[PDB]
Amino acid sequence: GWALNMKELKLLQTIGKGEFGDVMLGDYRGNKVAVKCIKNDAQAFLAEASVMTQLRHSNLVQLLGVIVEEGLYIVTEYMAKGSLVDYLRSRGRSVLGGDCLLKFSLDVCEAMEYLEGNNFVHRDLAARNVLVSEDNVAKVSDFGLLPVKWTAPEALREKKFSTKSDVWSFGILLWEIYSFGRVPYPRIPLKDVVPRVEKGYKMDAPDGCPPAVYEVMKNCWHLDAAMRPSFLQLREQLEHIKTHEL
Template structure:
């Protein structure tokens, strides 16, 4: 139920919020800051040779390319074909599309002194136009509970919304608001849309309302008599498309499961719950891990990547085609990793198409590098449409 026409995003105009703008630094300093030169890392600096202009420095395949950003006729341009009102709009364009650059802009290198601490997350949200007037929110019934507190139904500007509320026992807002900060960077039809954040007491993260709840409950409450094979394939394609986008943006979800997929009024599946999401390959502190959904290298070594998300997607597919059964139904959680390391995998759910089970098996390759990318999975699923 995505209706984004009523969401107004204010332009990013304030330099303080542009974490990738480093001001007067040299070409050599820029290249040092961009090390280890991973593809898509970037920063913007004042031009050394052309006062009043800028330089966009982008890493690709172990080197750095520098682009002259020209200020001309009160607009900014790199190629004198696309013109932008300000640096933020220029960066946003090249985040979405390389459009002639060596890579699209993926990971900003933060300017000196910037970190997610104190009020920086709130500052980021306010200065990039995501703070909304809490007086315009009508709070409704409780829908459930999340990592930090309750999730409530609400209304904002005459539209139904979901409200994630900060638990009053949580004193540090930044971990809670980090999810919203991540969502400001992600825009895709198969990701739950952030509408804004209402600061105050309590703090609300305001999200698009997903009328049919989470996928796990959807499957269990409707079952085989209601959920068709076409719906199952459509849900699979929706989720793979959303994850392919996350993969392209170098984000790792880390908690992909049917419980974290939401269903809209028009039966579109969208990935949600970005509370654990991080950029690129990350290490996670030991703690409570959903072992039955988690890749073996993530459980054993706490190393998460897009390929560990792919493993979880295979488990999610198994949930989808078993109509919400708990994975590894006859294996205790404590024994799951040993079971996997012995070469065992879950059997195909009853009536699951062979093509789908093959994708699950590919996702469950023990070596992460042998698993497919989400882009490949999405392409495979798209090709299955004629079979249903």
């Protein structure tokens, strides 16, 4: 049950590449699948496989299978609409209404809530790393083993990560969502980002952003990591917004 037959997998095309290795659109005996080709040692993740393969939730890319040492062929569900960043730029304001933005935010928040609950840190939360299914559901990944504009400032200095730094990246992600995928920190220069953020600078609300969504973003951006709200509390704040703001 986690091993698939390599004999039946077809690698069709490279569709992304992470540090781990490229990611491919594959064909597993009939269905479109996404495949993580690893070469450059994997042996780490594989030890934690059962526990990291224990991770299942509907907003986490589902694992289908795994080929090993021939250096892994990780097989997962295929997210037909790609990266949310790309989707937000493509679809843009014209296609994506207010219900769609809160649903993407809730989808990611629920996945974050879940990983938070299992004591798992994401470390690279950003609209680029969120995928959209053919059914319009945003999901994040569970495979696992510094981008200045997304990373909490204590995680840039300290080089260590926690759920609380994922909370900082989630606000940055909300800002991406509400701005239809604009690169973060449009008012300042890349070089100045860290030094302004460290003194409390916060991005202004995306154009047309709902006041209450802007407060959630702001709460994610506390400089005291411990004082950022949990994904459990974020989930309640976003559910609250959905219930009254519509």
